[PDB]
Structures are given as structure tokens and as C-alpha cells.
Structure 1
Amino acid sequence: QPEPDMITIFIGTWNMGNAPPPKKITSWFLSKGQGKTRDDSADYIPHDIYVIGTQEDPLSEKEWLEILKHSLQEITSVTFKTVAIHTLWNIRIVVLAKPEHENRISHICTDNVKTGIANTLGNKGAVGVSFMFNGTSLGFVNSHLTSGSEKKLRRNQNYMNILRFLALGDKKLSPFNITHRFTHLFWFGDLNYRVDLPTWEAETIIQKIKQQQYADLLSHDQLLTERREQKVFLHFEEEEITFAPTYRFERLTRDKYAYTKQKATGMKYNLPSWCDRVLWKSYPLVHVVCQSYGSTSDIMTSDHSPVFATFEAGVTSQFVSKNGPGTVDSQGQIEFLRCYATLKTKSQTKFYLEFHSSCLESFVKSQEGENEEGSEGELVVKFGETLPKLKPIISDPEYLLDQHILISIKSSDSDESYGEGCIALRLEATETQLPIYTPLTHHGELTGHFQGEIKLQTSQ
């Protein structure tokens, strides 16, 4: 039975509005309703992995697991295995996988982050799950961010706290946050970004939604505008939105948006908004294709509609050779030529690099680079031809060209990372000097760039 080179992943996010679900929710897992929907001819084909994020979830873990498993069994005739479940307050993540994957999944991690301080600590935050699927690392984050149209900057802060403090994936990757730890990272939830138009325009917005004319609404969506201005979710991707706003509905119909200020809303307007979102970030040149992104039309117990997204995702096998794992393969090497980091920092410490990758036995520290002043005020750290030759555990090009090198640039004075990035080994050629590039981030904000050339030797 061959190991897969691609899997499909279902991502669901639903703010349940503290109400139990209706008796049938299969439309969610079938990607049917509005937006980019799944073809009817696929209905019986199970996804490999289902990741369900809920917010304002009133159910016990047992109660929800029973509903989810019975839903999937009805659709697929498959009894899914529970990989992980984790709840913070009323924020929950469930991961289910086909039974055939049970011995492909390992290193399962769960964690949560509570956002805010005092007043603002006690119901918002995030849960997450990570695991290895054969040779591929997968991370999943369900976040319920701060509500309210005038709190976009709080949501951006909540994002920054979650990616700093959520402890998922390989703890040996100590310089790297969750935005670098995984081959594929999916981040979803009630992100709570709103359509920023005047309150007086509520009925105009409603009109536009009835005409399925979303363009003048999406141009005011705070998540799209904040992302464009690099304030949040830097280096993530979202599929184009082609479904109606998923909030705020009157319960038990989808015919009415309930936007007016009420005592129950703290006298806040809730103009129709795309609160409920799915974004992802995959390592460079790894296959990932969104095959659905939409909302259900027939699940009406909440003031939010469920959102679904599905993905094709490239995966790799747990590679064994005669040599690695447990030794190097002398037929393999990675060389970095003419490399330099450009950093936005005002500081004047020396810097060194760390190279981290599961193709190495352990991470590799470089010598200090040579600081120069850039023409436009920047710090340029030159490494020249000084960088250590990296010795991969396996030299087979079928393995090595699928790998990635994480890079951290660290202060010699503090050993703190000033920037993290990632280089693919999926090169156009081997034994050939080729340009490489990554942006560098720290706490998920842009701090610089790393560029130079690579020369990869494989056994072929």
C-alpha cells in the first residue's frame, strides 16, 4: 500500500453562538452552500483529515465528537479516528483522520493562548494542534479574536500574541514561532474583522449582499486592508471570498442580517461582516491548492454561518536510506555563497546564523558575519563564502529536493533571533550556483531579508 504524496484537508470554522447545532450539519463537511463549493461527484470521497474549529461552543467535547463522527460516518461510511481535541473556554479544535492514517500521524501537540489582560482576559484566545503526517509537519490554529468594528488594532495584537506564545511543533526549533515550524500551517476562526463602512450604510450593504455584489464590501474588509498594509497575517494566503458575509444573522433563518445596536450587543452595531475565515501559510514550493472556500446556507442555529475550506496539500514519506537516519550521507551537501542579511535594526551587535532542518542531524551555527552600513541607512551583515557546508542525513535527490532550511539571524550579544525565514531546496538544478531569498520576520513582523546563492549536491 503506497505512501501518499498528497492528502486533502478539510478546515471548518463555526461560531455556534452558544446554541446547540441542528440535527443535520453534513452540508458543512460537504463544502455546499455559497462561495467556492465542492462538486457533487466528490460527496462520498472522504478527506484525509478534518479540522473543526468552533467558537462560543456550548457542547462538551464528548457531545461534539459524537455529532462530528456520526456526521462524517453518514457522509463517507468511514469511522474517523480522533487525533486530538483541545478546548479553551468555549473555543475548541477537533482533528479527525481516516483510520488508514493512524500509523502515519505522530508527535501530536496541543496548546492554547489566552489573549488580553484583566478586563480583556477570560474569553478570547486560540487553541491549536500540530502533528507529523509521515515526513510533513502540519499545524492548525483556531482563534476567536477581539470583537467590535473599532477594535481592529486589538485583533492584530491578539494575532501577534497567539503566534508568539502558542507552543506547537518541534521545540528544538527554538528561534522559530508557529509561522515557521510547519510545512503547512492553517489559521482559522472567528477572526472578527469587520466591513468598515458607516453605520448609516447598513441597508445599502444588505442590498449589495442580496445582489451578490461583494466587491465594494470586500474593499472595506478590515482583514484584507490590514493584510495589504502588512499589519497582520504577513506571508499568509486566503482564497478569494465569493460568499455572503457570515455574520450577523437572525437565528433560525438566513433571510435577515441583525445589525442594529441592542443592549445585548453593548449598544454596538454589527454591520454584515466576514468574521469567519481560513488562511494558510506553506513552505516555499510545496504544493497547496484551495479546492473550496464558502459558507453553508442551511445551518441556522447561530448568528454566524459555518465556513468551510478544503485543500490539496503535498506530503512526503518517512525516508530511510542505508545511511541516514542515524548518520550523514557524504554524497550530499548544501553550500551558501555570497550570502548577506539586510536588517531593519538600529542595533550594532555582531550577528551569526543558525540553520535548522529535519534533513540535518542537528542545527548548525555559523561564524559571525561582517557588518556594513547600507546606502539607505540599513544594517547589511555579510557572510561571504564563510558559511558552514551543511551535511544532510540523506543524499537521495527524491528526498533532499523536498526539504527546507530554516534560517535565524541571532545577536552574538544576546543570542536572541532578530529574523527568521525559510529556503526551499526544490532547486532548478543541482551542482549549480542559484539565487536564494527569504524575507526575515520576528514575532511575525518584517525585520529584514536574507539572500545569496546556494549550491546543492545530491547523490545524482
Structure 2
Amino acid sequence: PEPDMISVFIGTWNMGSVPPPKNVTSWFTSKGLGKTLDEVTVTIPHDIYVFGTQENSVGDREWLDLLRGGLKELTDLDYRPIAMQSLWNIKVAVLVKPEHENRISHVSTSSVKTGIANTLGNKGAVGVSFMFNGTSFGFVNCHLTSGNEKTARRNQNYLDILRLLSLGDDISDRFTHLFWFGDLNYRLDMDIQEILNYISRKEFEPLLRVDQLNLEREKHKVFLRFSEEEISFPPTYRYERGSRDTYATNVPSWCDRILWKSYPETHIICNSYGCTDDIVTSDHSPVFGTFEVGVTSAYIEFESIEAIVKTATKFFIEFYSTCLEYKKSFENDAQSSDNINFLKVQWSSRQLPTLKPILADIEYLQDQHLLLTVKSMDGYESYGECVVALKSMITAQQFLTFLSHRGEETGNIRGSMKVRV
């Protein structure tokens, strides 16, 4: 009866403060350049459409009506808005096929301004989250600091959004699938003429080697734990308005991006990632991404858990899951330190709780996830969280993962657990 997979469309477009054209068909249908949807059979009406825009001067009401009208003319379906959020001229909207409206719950929205001198809200982010049956989704649409030289400012904008957006403890591990897209504004570290030469040859690999987002991700400095699909479309900025023949330091760049972060052992596949070449009202080309995503419609026991945490003495663990009705441990009963500012802490089975899932079916349990948070006895401060999938843990089996807190890696965790049915 209920679906076990959905198709999600994500579109991002910096509209350049001018009216869009009446027809943006190519954007909605993943047609143009890059990884595209070419066949009739794969160009499907998606279950969820998410539209993120920047420099959007269309009124909220009017823009949503254009999206609803556009989807209706395209699909013959009356797509239902489930949420929308604007921050000044940064706007996101989520629309769902009518047959799925009953499956949506726990809708949330949020926005954050980023700036030192500027808090107008033309730089920042907007966010929307919800549950589709038992699977949660977060969508963040941003517009970060511009300029070739401002990489460090963009990385800080990212960190500030991650820490301050109140969707649904940062947002990193709040959702089964977190999509982050927009005008990220990362540029190419290369001279204008060399860039244009490579673009003429349709040779994108030499350019992608000097893309600042790729370099910063590779250096572990931003978008930790996010993935991006391979880019095979030309830079989406900066074009002359009225054609895509001519690019206008502001060298050509892939400013407009879609990235995702998913819970372990989930099903997610990127089916398209590209840009249009026939929408020409803005100095940016619209970018599309489509995804196939899995959705979901007994005693959990721990033999032991060991963690290494950054600290300069006693810690406990909180266990959280949507499949539970929340639970906690006693303090660690052992600790040691090979190195200064790191503490190895151990919890024997006596210190650890037994968790009780709501249903006992294997098909239900294999799709669930546990959130573990390590907190200090003194102050109840989080020193790190991680997510463990139950899919491979159903004898005792070992999990091994890493602790994160507010965008910093803060240690690791290893444990033995049993899921009995």
C-alpha cells in the first residue's frame, strides 16, 4: 500500500532580481546540461518538488502561485504546498503530489541572517523540514558571501547557519536526509582566460580541480559529511542576460550547488544534477537535482560502549529514536588517557540501558536509527552525537562511528549491541 521510495526534485536559482520567464519547463524536468533526464519514462512527476531561489523579487504569494500553476500545467496534478519560507529575497517552497498530503507531518520552517555589517537578509538561509511517513527531511536554501577572495567568510556563513537554524544540538543529525542548496558562491582559483579556454573545449575536470567548494570539502573545512553528485555541466555564473552564448574578478564559477547528508545505511540515489541552457532572465542558470529516496512506514541491548572524547571527567549517554516512546545511561565506570585533551571512557553493561522499540517486526526495525549523545555529568553539555543504523545490527554486533558537535568532529565511539526479535 504505502510507498517504500519517493522521487524528490530540488531546484536552485539565483534570479538576479528580475522577473522570471513564464516558461521554466527545462528546470522542472531536468533538461539541459549535465546529468539530465532524457527519456519520457524517467521524466516523471516527482513526489516532492522543492524550489530554492535567491535574489527573488517576486512576491511570496505570486511566486508560490507560479510554481503551483507551473506544476499543474506540466503534470495535470494539483500539487499541494506544504510549506514555504522567505527571508527577504531568499525563498523556498515545498510542494507534494495530492495523494501524499496525508503522509506529511511535523512541518517546520526557519531562517537565519548571516552578516557582519549587513542584516537585511539578502545573505543567509531559509529552511523547511517535515516527515514523510516515518522518514524525516530537511531542506536548506542559502545565499552565502560573494567574491573570489571570501572563501573564509563563506565557510563561516555555513557554520553560523548550521548552528543557528532552528528546524524541527545542531541540525546536522536531526533529519534522515538533509539537503543543502543555493547560491553557495564558491569560485574557481584560476585566471579568466584559462577558464574560458577549458570551457570552450568542454573540459571541466581541470576547472573542478580548482573549485573552492571541492578544495574546502577535500580539506575538511566545510560541509562535513555531505555528498555532491559529479558535475558535468558548465559553470552557471556569470552569463549575459538574453542568451547563454557569452559569459559576462567574478570569473565563471559553479556558484549554484546541491549537496546532501543522509543517515547511514539509507537508500538515496541522485538521478539528475545539471543546469538549464534556455532560461536567460538572470546572470545565473537554474540548477536541478533529482533523487530517489527510501521511505519507511523487541529489545535493544548493549554489552559495552567505549568513546574517546575531547576534554580537559564523568560522562553519560542519551539514546533517542523515533521508534522509541528517550533513555539514558549511568556514568562511565572506567576511563584512561594516553594523550592530553583526550579521554577514553568506557561503559560496562551495568551502566547501559535496555531500549524497547514500538513494533517488533524485522521489516520495521531494520529501517530505524538510534541517536546517541555523550553528555558531561557536570553541566549536561553535549560533547558529541552520532547516528547508528539498526539495519546491520539485527548475537551481539559491533558498531563503530564518530562523534560530532556543532560542526566539529569531537571523537569516536565503538560499542557492542543486540537487537532481539
What is the TM-score when the length of structure 2 is the normalising length? 0.97
Partner of 2:329: helix, strand, or coil? strand
Tell me how large the CA RMSD over aligned residues is.
Answer: 1.4
Larger displacement relative to structure 2 (62-71 or 416-425)? 62-71
Aligned to 2:353: 388
Aligned mates of 1:280, 1:374 — CA distance in 2 = 36
Matched residues, number:
419
Residue 448 of structure 1 is aligned with which of 380, 399, 411?
A: 411
Residue 186 of structure 1 is aligned with which of 162, 179, 187?
A: 179
Over residues 154-187 of structure 1, what are the superposed CA-to-partner deviations in whole Å (9 max), with x where a residue is unaligned? 1111111111111112xxxxxx321111111111
Identity of aligned residues (%): 59
Matches within 5 A, 1:55-454: 55-119=54-118, 122-169=121-168, 176-197=169-190, 201-258=191-248, 269-317=249-297, 332-343=298-309, 345-347=310-312, 349-361=313-325, 363-369=326-332, 370-374=334-338, 378-385=342-349, 386-427=351-392, 430=394, 432-454=395-417
Aligned mates of 1:209, 1:399 — CA distance in 2 = 49
- Code of the aligned partner of 2:105: S
- Code of the aligned partner of 1:94: A
Q: CA deviation at 1:308?
A: 0.3
Over residues 139-164 of structure 1, what are the superposed CA-to-partner deviations in whole Å (9 max), with x where a residue is unaligned? 10001111111111111111111111
Check the 8 A contact 1:26/1:72 in 2, yes or no: no
Q: CA deviation at 1:387?
A: 1.4
Aligned mates of 1:390, 1:337 — CA distance in 2 = 13
Check the 8 A contact 1:115/1:121 in 2, yes or no: no
Q: CA deviation at 1:243?
A: 0.5
Q: CA deviation at 1:382?
A: 0.9
Aligned to 1:324: none
Q: 1:365 to 1:43 in 2, by over 3 A?
A: closer
Structure 2: runs of 5+ lacking an equivalent: none
Q: CA deviation at 1:256?
A: 1.2
Structure 1: runs of 5+ lacking an equivalent: 170-175, 259-268, 318-331
Aligned mates of 2:338, 2:52 — CA distance in 1 = 46
Aligned mates of 1:254, 1:203 — CA distance in 2 = 18
- Code of the aligned partner of 2:292: E
Larger displacement relative to structure 2 (295-304 or 379-388)? 379-388
Partner of 1:292: helix, strand, or coil? strand
Matches within 5 A, 1:38-49: 38-42=37-41, 45-49=44-48
Check the 8 A contact 1:43/1:75 in 2, yes or no: no
Over residues 331-364 of structure 1, what are the superposed CA-to-partner deviations in whole Å (9 max), with x where a residue is unaligned? x111222311112x232x3111111101111x11
- Code of the aligned partner of 2:68: K
Check the 8 A contact 2:37/2:43 in 1, yes or no: no
Aligned to 1:327: none
